[PDB]
Structure formats: C-alpha cells, structure tokens
Symmetry: C2
Subunit: 573 residues, 2 copies
Amino acid sequence: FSRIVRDVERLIAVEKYSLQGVVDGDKLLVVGFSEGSVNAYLYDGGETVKLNREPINSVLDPHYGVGRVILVRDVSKGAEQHALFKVNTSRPGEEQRLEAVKPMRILSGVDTGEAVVFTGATEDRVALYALDGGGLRELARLPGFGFVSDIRGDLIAGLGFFGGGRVSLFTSNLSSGGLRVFDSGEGSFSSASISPGMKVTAGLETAREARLVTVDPRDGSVEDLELPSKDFSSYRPTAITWLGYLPDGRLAVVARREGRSAVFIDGERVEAPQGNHGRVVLWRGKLVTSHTSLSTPPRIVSLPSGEPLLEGGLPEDLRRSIAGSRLVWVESFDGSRVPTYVLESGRAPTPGPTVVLVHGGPFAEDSDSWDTFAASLAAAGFHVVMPNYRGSTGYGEEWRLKIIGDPCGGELEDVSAAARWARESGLASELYIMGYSYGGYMTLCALTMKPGLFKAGVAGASVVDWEEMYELSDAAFRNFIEQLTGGSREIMRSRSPINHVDRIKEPLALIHPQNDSRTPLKPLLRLMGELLARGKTFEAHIIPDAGHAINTMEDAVKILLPAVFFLATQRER
Amino acid sequence: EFSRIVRDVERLIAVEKYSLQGVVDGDKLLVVGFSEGSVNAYLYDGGETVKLNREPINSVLDPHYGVGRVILVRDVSKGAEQHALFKVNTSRPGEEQRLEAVKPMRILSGVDTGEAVVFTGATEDRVALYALDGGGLRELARLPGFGFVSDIRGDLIAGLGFFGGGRVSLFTSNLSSGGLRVFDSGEGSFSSASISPGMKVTAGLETAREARLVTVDPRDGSVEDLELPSKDFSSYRPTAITWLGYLPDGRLAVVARREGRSAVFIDGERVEAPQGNHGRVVLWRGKLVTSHTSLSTPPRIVSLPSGEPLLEGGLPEDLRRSIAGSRLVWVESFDGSRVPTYVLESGRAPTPGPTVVLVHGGPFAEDSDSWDTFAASLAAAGFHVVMPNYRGSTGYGEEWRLKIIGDPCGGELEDVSAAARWARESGLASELYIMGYSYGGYMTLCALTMKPGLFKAGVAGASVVDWEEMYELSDAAFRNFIEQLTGGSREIMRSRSPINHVDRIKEPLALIHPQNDSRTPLKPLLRLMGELLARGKTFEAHIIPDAGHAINTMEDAVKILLPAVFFLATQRERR
C-alpha cells in the first residue's frame, strides 16, 4: 500500500542524533540523520548549524573544546573508502580534505586539535595512524579491527578485535608509535579512557558481570577500579557501553544489563530516560547524553531531567503502531535462554503475522533501542521478534563468544528457537525472517537449513559465501572472517548458504547495496544465478551507489521499502 | 514523494481495461478484462459481467459466433508461458476443465470453432499448428516460425506466419487432415485475415507505405484486389490494417489505421468511432461493437457509431489531468527518414520539463494513440513522454517496418536517439531519460552503451541483453525470431548485444526483470549485472518473483512499473 510507503518514509525521515562531544569552545557536536542524510551539526541551545557540505558517515571524536571537526566521508559511492575532511567550527560548511590520508576504511579516530589519530583498513593492513603538522605516520599495524578510544597527552588507548572474537586493549604513543596489546584472560575490554594518572580505565566484560579496571600501560598490571559511589558496582552491569573522563575529572560510565543502560558519574547513578545511552559529555557544567529506546529515535537529552536538546519527534500514530514490547527469554535447543525483544504491532491481530528480525554484527544486540526496521514492520502490521542469538553483545563474554567457529550453527538454532517461541507463545499466526548483514546471512541460513520454519525470508546486505567474500575483503574483514569462522575452509564452505541452495523452498527477497564492501554483491549475483538455475522463487533489489552503511533517507527507503512490500505481499497468501 | 507515485501507479494499473474477443453463449459479448487486479474473461449480457474463469488468465481463444464455451489460456509455469488450455461452458461460469490432451506450451494464438480448438504453439523443437477435437489432439502442420490462427470456416484454417525476413505470410491448413500452404506476397506482408463465405481468404496486405485488401484463393494462390461496395476505405488510404473479419451477415468489418489512429469500415463504408484505436468489430443485438482506446482512454468496449461505452474503467479526475495532451510529430533521423513519434505532455511537468523517451517493444509494434499505462504513470510522475516509432515499427508501412531486419541496435536506435534530441531541441525536454520494456529495454541498454551522455539515465525492463545467450535459451519460435531480426549473422548477434559494450556505460541504469521470463531470460541479465559490478558501473536492479514477460496481475504490474518511476523520480532530484 501507499500507506506502507508513507509510514516507512516517515519512520526513516524522523531525525536521529548521536552525541559526539563538545567543540568550538562549548558547543555540542552531534551527528544527525536529518534533512535527508547524515550530517554533522553544532548545537548551542537553539538551532543547529550544519558543519558539512555533502553527506558524511561520521565524525572523529573531538577533544573537548577543539575548534574543528574531522568529517569522515565515503568517496567511493558506498564502498567505504573514506577520506577525512576538516571543518573549522568558526567557518561551518567550508571543508578541507586531509589529502595526506589516501582513501581507506576509516574505523575510528580521535582529533586532539593538534593530531588526528585514527585506525583504518586497506587491502593489506589495519593500522593506527597519526596525522599532525609533520604529516602522516603509521604508528602501528594492528592484527585486525581496531578502534581508538582515547588520547591523553602522548598516550593512545584503543580496543582491538585481534583474535578469537576477544577484545584487547591496546596502547600506542603519539610521538613514537608502537603497539602494546593487553589481553584479559577473563574477558574482553569494551571501553577505555586514560586517567589523569596516565593509566587506562577500561570496561572489562567477563563471562557474567562487567567491571571497571585500571590497566597500567607500563607493565600491563590490572587492578579493579573502585569508585567513590558504589551505585555502579552494585548495579552489576553485564556490559559497559562507554566510559570517559569529563573535563572536571569525573569518570562517566554508561553500563547496561538486559538491553537497558544506566549512567554513572564517579560511580553515582545519574537518572536518565529509560532505554539506552551513549557518551556523556559535560556541556556548560551540565550532563548530556544521547538516549534511545524501542519507541524513541536516538536523541540528545540533558541529565538528570531527560529534557531533550535535539529530538526527532516520533509522530503519535507511528508510536501507537507499537502496542507493546516485551523482553522474553526464548528456550533454545541446548537450554540457553535467548533474551529476545518483541514488539507487538497495534496493526496486527494476535496471533498475527510476525517477523523474526535478526540483528547484524554478529557482535551487536537487540536492546531497548530504536530500530527503524522493527518500527516499520510494526507500522506495517507485523509483530517483531528480535532474538539475541549467541554471538550477541550485552549478555556477557560467554554468550558472545559462543558463535566463534560456529556461524550457521548455534546462533541459527537461537533464531529458530525464537520462531518456535513466537508460534507456541501464541504471538505468531505466521512467521517470516528478515535481516540485514549477519541478519541477512541468518535469513539465508534459515531458508537453506530450516526450510519450512518460515513462510518467507528477506535477506539484506547478506553474507552469502564466506570464502569468496573473504577473498574480496580488506585486511580488517579478512581477519574478522577468520575469527568468526575459526580459520577453517570447511566451516567457510559448509556454513555458506550458497552451498545449500537446493534446500530452499520459501520465497526469498534479496536486498543488497551494489557497492557494499563488507558483504559484497558478487557472491549475491552468484546466489541469484543458483536460485535461477534451480528453479527457486526469488526477488532481488540492488540499490545503486550505495554500500553497507546507509547515509541517506532515500537509500534507507530503497533498502527497507522492498522488504516491507515483500512481507505485505506474502501476508496476502 | 514516493507514496504519491505508488498511489498514481497503482490506480493507473488498477483502472479497468477491456478487449473485445467475440460473441458467445448465443448472444453475449466475450470480453477479456483487467479487473479486480487481474486478467479475467467475462460475458457481458448488457447489465453486469459474469466472470467465466477462476484464477487469472493470459487470454482466451477467438470464439466462433455463439459457441457455448470459452477456452482460457493460462500460464501454468509461474511466468515462463508454458500455457494450458481450460474450457469453460458459458452456461456454467467459473467451472474449468483443463484440456489435458494439450501439454503445456507457449500458446501463440487460437480459435474455437465449437467442435475444434485450433491453436498455434511453440515448444522447444517447433512451432506447430494444432487442432483438438473430440477425436483428440492432432498436429496439423509445423510452422517455419511464429504463426497465428486468424480464422476458420468449415475445414479451412487461415493464419499469418512470420516465416522469414520479418515478412508475414498467409498460411492455410485443413482442419480435418492438416497440411500447410504458404502464400507470400512480394509486395508486402499480410496483416489480418478472414475467410469469406466463398471460402477465399480476405487479407490485409501491407505494402511499402500503404495497405490494401486482397482476396487469396487457397487452392491456386491466386491473389486479386478486393473491391468493396463503399469507397470510404480506399479513400481513407490506410497505412496498416489492424483487423478484419466477416460478420455473421456476410458484411466485412475492417479496422485500418493511419498515423496511430484507426477507422472502422463495414463493407468499405466508414462507421464513425471514437478517436484513437479500435480492435475487432462484432455484431451484437444488431449493433456494431468494438474496443476503443486512446492515449487518454484505457481500453474499453463501445457501441458504434454512437461511441457510447458498454464496458469502461473510469480514471480518477486527478490522473486524467496529468495528461495535458498528445500529439504526433515526425522527427528527422540520421538518414532523413521521418520518425513518427507520439508525444504525451505531462500537465505535471513544466515545458521544458523532465522527459522520458519511452521505447516500445516488439520491435513490430507501435506507439499509437492508444492507452499506455507506463506512459500514463510517467505523465503522472511529472515526465513528458516521447514515444518514437523507430524503424521496425508497425503502423507506417512494410518498408519502415522491415528496415530493422539485420540491423538491431542500428537505425532504430538512431531513430530513438533522434527523438531524444528532438525533445531537447524543440524545447520540450529539460532533461532526457530512456525507458523501455522488452525490445524497449534492449533499446535502453543500447542507448546507454552506444550513446553515453545522450540520456541522464535509463530504465531497462525485461530487456534483451545478449542475442547469443538468449538464442541458446530460446524455444523454436524465439530462435527463429532472433534469426530473422539479426539476419542469421553471428556478428550482429554479438556486436549489437549491449552486454559486450558495458565498458561504455556512463549513466545510472535501472534493470527490472521478471525471474521466469522465457522470452528475454534473466540469465543474461545476471551476467550484465556481474559486468556492471566488475566495471564499477552505477546500477539498480529489481527482479520480480514468479513472473515472466507477460504480466497478468496488478501486483506484478506494480512490481515492474513502480521501480522504474521511483528510479526516474529519484534521478530528477539529481543534476
């Protein structure tokens, strides 16, 4: 229906904001999907001032008060070969490309105002780079995906996915480069910030709980960090989203459990709107973070009031289309409880058409956080089931690392268990699977390995063939695929759904951005080739000049709309 | 913006469209309607319609006057056009009997005498003429290429055959004992046929730049000119004959045309008809009835000479207003030839305004003053539409039509290109797009490969991509038809295939393709996508499930059209 498209359009079009920091003296730096695209803005109590010209993907983390912003922009029509552009915050809309940085996959970065330190992947390497007045320097080659978390003085701290799905802390020196990696035997570092003492405060996520530790970069000694207020440790977080020192020396921590987060300043709980929060900044002496929930598009709020600085208003009709949300614990094949977010649509009966909407990553989670796809499905009259299959973040190290070496195994059982739950709990009169990226991989895996479980499947930006994808991947993705698959060619082959096409029996909608460089299109063309040759029912939608990271409202429509149409169409059968 | 396009495309698709097939059930019109979202078949008594079929159909066989049944043609292969025949007794609507003696095949045409169901169909190994009577199925003749049953009277079958060089032969067979006689005119092509009571075949003969009627005797191949009592037909100077047929009273109805509009003639005498195009004419309740269409009027059944509608879909007022007007223009092409080009002006676009060269399929087809949903949706979306009858087109004589032979992606593309440049130079077009389905999509691919920079973007639906692979995958009819279009030249098949010039593409391209297309198969389209990808080309693709070349549902029409209009509307926001 045209009503579908209008709702899909409006959900996409609602402005969404993330908090990046404080720049231009004491002005908020936010990135907003607004006015049709992702842009950087200054906010200082009134109207936003747009910093960039053309759409961007992100900005680098500014040190407090810096008079510039580094835009990260895709210059490869979606393939995520990014260049960096600086904007002097005094002169909004004037851009200077940082030409010493050849286009690469920029993974992360920080701008101190005097040096831009970033990680990026090329075909041959992941590396940590510093660009300052003397030009560009490779500080270190990283084993895999690596992210700069912080710079204080000469010390750079970061997080590395350098093996086994485990996250290491790494440090380097701005002046001299080099690399020190710190692994924990208990889990993975999730967050880091260098203290005034020049040690690294980090979130350590273990099997069950998460805690703060202090890593001394000189010897690798680790000790628990105890905070003045005990609200934080008595909250017993399973995950630590974010931490940072504020300008006044207080330590802000955002930690979470069961898909909802809480904010702590020197260990003391700060009231915040229910859902999930990102970074906390001090702006004009006051606390500010971003907030999201299943019914709240990412917005910037003041704490503790929850009062919005920057909020794209979810229209009340779209809000009403989500009649309810539960967190349930699906019983899986091996007795694992799969924490599963559920939206009941106010536009479906119960039992009703239900989509198991599978998250990407796999190191991500369905949480009490805004999900445009899920909202659009609920607007479209589908209940939504969003299972945190093993591999997911947010439920501890053991749950997340279970997926390692076992793609299309236990995690798909969790997805299937969620389908089973949806029917047996009485929610679903019929079941569909939909997912993007690792989610689309899961759609494909479900239709090949679990024919008959779903009525139909939507597979967006999907993993189709680990082997071919690997061979087309840059250094970061190659390493990531190695970790996920265990290195084994058996696993890479046997867990690729393009090798199990014969088993497909349900309608399949393929959606894929043409210049996706994470989940490349080439394997997907071969999949369509196989689907065609084997007489399989399928549709496909290839979106032009776009990649994995959707940064315009029209691209988001192009990749979401066909999914919703497909499922609406299937529902008339 | 997108939601308004969905609403306009949906409702333009959804408006009821009718084609007159004949008279059956004694004295009721048989009508194939696109209504309630699909192609169905109906009896029309004068009041309400009775739906004959159950599930959607592709067509019905031409009924002998008054026969008490209908034969439905239905794709039983999810779009690949392996059709089965189903008989419905007109006294028992909605009750279908599959004719099991006829294995699924591409049914090309057919007639039902009441005693025999006579049809042509294409399989892998042949195009044949068949007769199914109470004794069972008989293959009457193998045809050299695409052939169509035009008429039957007693044991004489007359038909038209594309049996070489893009020329149309007349053929006859014997209903009882088969065989084949082929009648070729060195002056042109036979275009319609009907057997007179004197058991002679009356036939439209389309010569170089004009069209006339001739009588063919099937016994001795004698051809003489048919001279009618009234000279209105002669004086009309038709360039083509749409259809002819003897009515039950022996009078000869002819629908002939000039410059994309037709005229109705009974025994040579003008019967006034609503402006545009008409189909077959029947007698019913002592009154003439035909189908009528125009660029602004969805196919409808009307009575002649009053022009009053009997069955018509009503367009919403907002969408009628989106068509500002239509005109025929003659665009000078590369050799001084004049390309007859219908121009549909959008009342939702400025002048100059965004303009789509909507290229017709076939290639033996034409852009006439006839309803075109694609064009209408384009007008609705704020695009002017330019619709060039490139050489290869029907409607303008044999010579113009046959010029395409041996020359796909040659002169016809220059004609399309000449219409494009005319739309800019005349001041109609502020920017230019190309869009086409089937041979039209081929033309899109050819324009973008051979004429980079001409258009801002192209939409290629159900497109020919590669003559060579397509030939590898075609049935007997399509192999032959590719042979004809390319002249039997391997060099033409390769060099005129856009798959081999992908390097040259500089403009965004949208590909729309039904997955089960057995005419313009998807396989070469996948290869084109692999080429586009490998060569860094911007493209969009939309593959339609469980559908093929012939769209018989609303939802499938939406799936092929909607992305085209989205794509073009999105391109218009661009530079």
